Amino acid sequence: LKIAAFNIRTFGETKMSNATLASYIVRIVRRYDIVLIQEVRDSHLVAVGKLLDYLNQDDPNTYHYVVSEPLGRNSYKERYLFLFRPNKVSVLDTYQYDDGCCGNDSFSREPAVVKFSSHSTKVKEFAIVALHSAPSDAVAEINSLYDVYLDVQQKWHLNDVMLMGDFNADCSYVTSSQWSSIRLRTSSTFQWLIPDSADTTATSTNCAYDRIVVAGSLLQSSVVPGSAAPFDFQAAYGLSNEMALAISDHYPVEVTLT
Amino acid sequence: DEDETTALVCDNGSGLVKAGFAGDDAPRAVFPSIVGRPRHQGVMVGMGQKDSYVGDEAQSKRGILTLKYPIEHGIITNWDDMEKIWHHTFYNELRVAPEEHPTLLTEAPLNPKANREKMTQIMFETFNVPAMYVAIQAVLSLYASGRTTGIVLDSGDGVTHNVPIYEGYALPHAIMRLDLAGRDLTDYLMKILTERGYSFVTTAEREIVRDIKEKLCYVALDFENEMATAASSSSLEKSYELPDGQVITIGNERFRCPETLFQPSFIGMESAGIHETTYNSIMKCDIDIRKDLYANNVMSGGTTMYPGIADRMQKEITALAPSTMKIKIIAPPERKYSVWIGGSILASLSTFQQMWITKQEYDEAGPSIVHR
Numbered sequence A: 001l002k003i004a005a006f007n008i009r010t011f012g013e014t015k016m017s018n019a020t021l022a023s024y025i026v027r028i029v030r031r032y033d034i035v036l037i038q039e040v041r042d043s044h045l046v047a048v049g050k051l052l053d054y055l056n057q058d059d060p061n062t063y064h065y066v067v068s069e070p071l072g073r074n075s076y077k078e079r080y081l082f083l084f085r086p087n088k089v090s091v092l093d094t095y096q097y098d099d100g101c102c103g104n105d106s107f108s109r110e111p112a113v114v115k116f117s118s119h120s121t122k123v124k125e126f127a128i129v130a131l132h133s134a135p136s137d138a139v140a141e142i143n144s145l146y147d148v149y150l151d152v153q154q155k156w157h158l159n160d161v162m163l164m165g166d167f168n169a170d171c172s173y174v175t176s177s178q179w180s181s182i183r184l185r186t187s188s189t190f191q192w193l194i195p196d197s198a199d200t201t202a203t204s205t206n207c208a209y210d211r212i213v214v215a216g217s218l219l220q221s222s223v224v225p226g227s228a229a230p231f232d233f234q235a236a237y238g239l240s241n242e243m244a245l246a247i248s249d250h251y252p253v254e255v256t257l258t
Numbered sequence B: 001d002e003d004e005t006t007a008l009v010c011d012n013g014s015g016l017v018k019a020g021f022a023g024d025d026a027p028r029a030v031f032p033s034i035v036g037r038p039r040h041q042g043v044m045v046g047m048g049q050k051d052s053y054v055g056d057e058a059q060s061k062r063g064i065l066t067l068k069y070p071i072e073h074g075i076i077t078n079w080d081d082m083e084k085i086w087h088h089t090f091y092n093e094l095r096v097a098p099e100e101h102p103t104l105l106t107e108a109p110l111n112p113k114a115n116r117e118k119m120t121q122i123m124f125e126t127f128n129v130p131a132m133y134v135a136i137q138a139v140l141s142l143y144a145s146g147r148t149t150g151i152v153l154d155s156g157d158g159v160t161h162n163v164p165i166y167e168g169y170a171l172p173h174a175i176m177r178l179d180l181a182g183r184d185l186t187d188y189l190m191k192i193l194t195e196r197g198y199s200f201v202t203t204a205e206r207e208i209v210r211d212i213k214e215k216l217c218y219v220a221l222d223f224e225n226e227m228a229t230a231a232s233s234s235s236l237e238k239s240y241e242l243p244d245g246q247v248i249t250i251g252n253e254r255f256r257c258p259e260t261l262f263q264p265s266f267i268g269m270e271s272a273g274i275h276e277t278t279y280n281s282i283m284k285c286d287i288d289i290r291k292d293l294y295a296n297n298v299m300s301g302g303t304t305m306y307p308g309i310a311d312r313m314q315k316e317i318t319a320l321a322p323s324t325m326k327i328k329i330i331a332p333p334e335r336k337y338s339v340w341i342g343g344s345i346l347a348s349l350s351t352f353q354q355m356w357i358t359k360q361e362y363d364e365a366g367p368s369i370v371h372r
């Protein structure tokens, strides 16, 4: 099971209209059995529409989706899209975290939470919590995911949860001293898979902004050691610096279960 | 009250449904006449798999569904998808149970006998309404303007019609239908606005050309020396701010769009236009009734709302009609709901009770009963 999280900058109608860009997004997406795509700025859903026409042009069911409604206190919004190969996993259930929206709401873009059922892995059921944090707010939000993990446990009585997305978790947005205030980091319930080492930006910066975090004893026993890493599509696909960034300024972070 | 409160009025259109309770002044529910069917398998967060979508959820989610219009040119073309729009209207939009509400429905001008019998079959046999009634649309528009004889120019989203009515009976052989309406009109503006050097590229650009048409479009009288005026370039121009900053300017085209209703030639249509058609309807009627029709040109429909439509029509038919005649173009302000309001009045009326087709009439006479 190859799982990944991919922030495609401004995935939209326009981005899907370039053929060259569209072909590379489709090719990346086809490396994964479960993919989360962030920064889905698609109002009518036309762009998600095009992306699935491409994935499903020859079997109608190569991929099935889960999509949020648009999200943002900010009010310039984006959605969460999961796309999974239905022959590999099923979606048992789903909900949008209730962050308090007022003034209190803990997140810019409330995690969509999706419970999967997998039969070829050691973990047979597990939830995936999705987050693209407001960079400005990164420290409070990676910490409030501790509370979304606790909700998945109340609601679904599930320990094996994966939390992933673009956490803006490094460089200026979270520093060495701030980590000490993120429960998601301090609680040894959670194993962080993409280290603080990792560069997950397509631009010149080096930051491990993009994370995959696993709690659950069985989920942690299913992660194939050392498969968790970013995907350098520029380096893999020989792209230029110009082309690579035209896809996104970020790289997928993937992991493999077994 | 039993049914004083209880009568429903549903006006089925080519673009919009208008619905609500007889008694109200305006429709409680207005929404697109679409039924979306998802192109792929999947779900929204927190919802289950949905087989179908109707109205605004079909419009909003249009990128993953195949949209379909049940009513082509005012006539119901797909009965599976129409029963879906009705279901949505009762249960979700008005949130009523239909089996205890009398339902007044509307049909189009020369609606095939068989359809009026079919929607009766579906109203009584799949929705189990107590009683129902089908009114002709132009006829409710006229009546909502107080009168009983006049000629209605009715124009909405997919059809335009002229329905001469005399003491309530719409005159079959004098009715004219022109298949060019507000839908056609938004797509023509689209091109004269891209042709002004623009791009309605994403779907958030497409949709708002229609909101430009509604807000800024005009029907000028003397459309001749209005183009001439455009050229001297007066402060006739009008800039609209898009979803974002992108201030688009529309000076002139603003009225080139409703000049399409008088000149179908602007759009490769060879048919005659609105005013000539008003007139031709009229020289197809009895002679003795033509002074009546001329002093009672009632307008209804979303596309007849373009300001100065009435003045242009006023002068358009004065100058075709014999000078001994009195011309009079009535265009009320609520006209985008005339049809509905005429139904609300009629169905809440004290004397209408004895025309309701009841399940007693139906179970005993077959669909023929309401067909008249």
Ligand SMILES: *[C@H]1O[C@H](CO)[C@@H](O[C@@H]2O[C@H](CO)[C@@H](O[C@@H]3O[C@H](CO)[C@@H](O)[C@H](O)[C@@H]3O)[C@H](O)[C@H]2NC(C)=O)[C@H](O)[C@H]1NC(C)=O
Pocket: A017, A018, A019, A020, A021, A242, A243, A246
């Ligand atoms: C979508 O993809 C590419 C990447 O964003 C778009 O442009 C790329 O980068 C340059 C600048 O647009 C393109 O070449 C240009 O050619 C003109 C013609 O002489 C020149 O004036 C510029 O200096 C520039 O060199 C190039 O085609 C393209 N890169 C690649 C690898 O294709 C491209 O325009 C997009 N296509 C569409 C349909 O939007």
Ligand SMILES: Nc1ncnc2c1ncn2[C@@H]1O[C@H](COP(=O)(O)OP(=O)(O)OP(=O)(O)O)[C@@H](O)[C@H]1O
Pocket: B012, B013, B014, B015, B016, B017, B073, B074, B155, B156, B157, B158, B159, B160, B181, B182, B183, B210, B213, B214, B215, B300, B301, B302, B303, B304, B305, B306, B336
């Ligand atoms: N202010 C306005 N100016 C011009 N066009 C308008 C305006 N308001 C609504 N319309 C147009 O009228 C159409 C909707 O009107 P209407 O409800 O009369 O049609 P309908 O009943 O759905 O269809 P049919 O053609 O079958 O009667 C759309 O094209 C809409 O843009």
Ligand SMILES: [Ca+2]
Pocket: A072, A073, A099, A100, A101, A105, A106, A107, A108, A109, A110
């Ligand atoms: Ca929020």
Ligand SMILES: [Ca+2]
Pocket: A199, A200, A201, A202, A203, A204, A205, A206, A207
């Ligand atoms: Ca980098």
Ligand SMILES: [Ca+2]
Pocket: A170, A171, A196, A197, A198, A206, A207, A208
């Ligand atoms: Ca680092």
Ligand SMILES: [Ca+2]
Pocket: B012, B013, B014, B137, B156, B339
């Ligand atoms: Ca109508």
